[PDB]
């Protein structure tokens, strides 16, 4: 039975689709059977795997409105125990699907939850890319799933930007995922030295410290450190330990892996 | 007055669309350009940008778009004379529901936001429009509104794809909602000129887009706002760059930026 982790931020450009392609990886290595949904439209996870837009046939959004089963659109990676249930920029379509079933129902919340279905018994994990926004599809991925992955890049906007998502979450908490839980928070792009960074932290540790990923052989905070090798990754269409798995982004991402493992 | 309308967008997150509406609007404002910064992200960061709190703020955008309040009725002062915001709440996030609703009745809501300007328009030389990261209705409605479409582009791998995605919504819209509508240009931002994926993304997007580039006329050059400590700190005191330090890499590059908008 798989344990489904969503990595959810409604901010832009922190780290949410490298997060969920580099730990969906670090878990495969190890011969566990890992399903990665890339649940965002522009579907930056497809193509940091090597799969170009235009090769893509049905994705997710063919799932969600029932023209194919999930089983039918799940892709084979580089990686045998990997395998990636595609996005495209039909899924921009699921926003007036979702709009339109609350109107025959209440429930569009449940319709990734629902599509995956026949797939949870199958994989160890199934690891979901969110688009940034607290809209539908991000609604959806955190419905779906048993826990969230929150990655923070700190900066400015991450203080204001987590009390809303954590309040987004607490929200599904009552009404439609009771099961809910916050996996961690990952600092990601981290730059140690910085007195932005240094203010940012801080001030979420104040709070939030419990929730912050720790390595379980070392007891340290686990932060995905800025590097050069982690931004040029999606262009070779690899994850990053296929090729360079002693880079300190590799190895991050590698203990992140071993955290969520020990449960 | 007639004022230029300008989007910024991008439907990549975090690539800087906030800082290039923020303090465009702010370099434009200082030469006594009156400016009205448009804050259409549900996140509402140019509203903080400026040094507002969010849960503060009564009525919003998403009010104006449904027709609760009239936009003078939500304009508020900033600390600069010349430039005015209107501001976003999380609220924001309720107009696609409006945006379907419409679309299924009249076939309408592109329209939305270029409406609502109507009545400030000869009130304004810019108004600068910050979009969300997404290519949904609350960003149809920026670019079915502009003039013109500022494109700031991080240089790593996702740019290339998503970059002509962008513009086959720019084409698709110059067909039907908003025929004027115009890339003002493709500015590069978070700049570190040496990394070696920075090199080989700009040499792809030049191959393609070299025409779409922001020039410096004077000298001929690519405008590109470099990476900076001090732009990233800058919304943290409720400042533009240029209040927060002006003789700062990235101040002088937004007031490129702005001298470029302003010759034309
Ligand atoms: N630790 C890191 N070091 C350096 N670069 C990184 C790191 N993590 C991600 N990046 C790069 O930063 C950019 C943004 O990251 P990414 O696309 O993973 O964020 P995202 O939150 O998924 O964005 P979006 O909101 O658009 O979905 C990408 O170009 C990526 O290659
Ligand atoms: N040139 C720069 N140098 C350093 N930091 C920058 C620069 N430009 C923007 N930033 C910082 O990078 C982050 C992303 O920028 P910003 O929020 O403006 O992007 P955005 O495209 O509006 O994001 P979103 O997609 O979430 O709306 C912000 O924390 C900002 O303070
Ligand atoms: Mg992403
Ligand atoms: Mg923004």
């Known amino acids: 039975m798989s344990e489904i982790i969503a990595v959810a931020n409604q901010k832009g450009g922190v780290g949410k689709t490298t997060t969920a392609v580099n730990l969906a990886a670090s878990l495969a290595v190890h011969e566990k059977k890992i399903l990665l949904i890339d649940f965002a439209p522009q579907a930056n996870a497809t193509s940091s795997l090597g799969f170009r837009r235009d090769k893509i046939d049905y994705d997710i959004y063919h799932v969600l409105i029932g023209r194919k089963q999930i089983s039918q659109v799940i892709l084979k990676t580089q990686m045998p125990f990997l395998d990636l249930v595609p996005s495209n920029l039909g899924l921009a379509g699921f926003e007036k699907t979702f709009y339109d079933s609350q109107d025959e129902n209440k429930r569009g919340e449940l ?153």
């Open 111 to 263: 319709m990734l939850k629902n599509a995956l279905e026949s797939v949870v018994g199958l994989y160890d994990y199934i690891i979901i890319d969110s688009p940034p926004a607290l809209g539908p599809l991000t609604i959806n991925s955190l419905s779906a799933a048993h826990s969230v992955i929150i990655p923070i890049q700190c900066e400015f906007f991450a203080l204001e930007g987590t009390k809303l998502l954590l309040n987004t979450i607490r929200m599904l908490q009552k009404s439609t995922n009771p099961k809910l839980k916050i996996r961690g928070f990952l600092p990601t792009m981290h730059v140690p030295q910085l007195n932005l960074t240094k203010g940012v932290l801080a001030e979420l540790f104040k709070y939030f410290d419990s929730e912050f990923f720790r390595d379980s052989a070392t007891g340290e905070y686990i932060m995905i450190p800025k590097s050069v090798k982690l931004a040029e990754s999606p262009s070779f269409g690899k994850p990053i330990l296929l090729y360079d798995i002693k880079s300190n982004g590799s190895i991050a991402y590698q203990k992140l892996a071993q955290s969520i493992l020990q449960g």
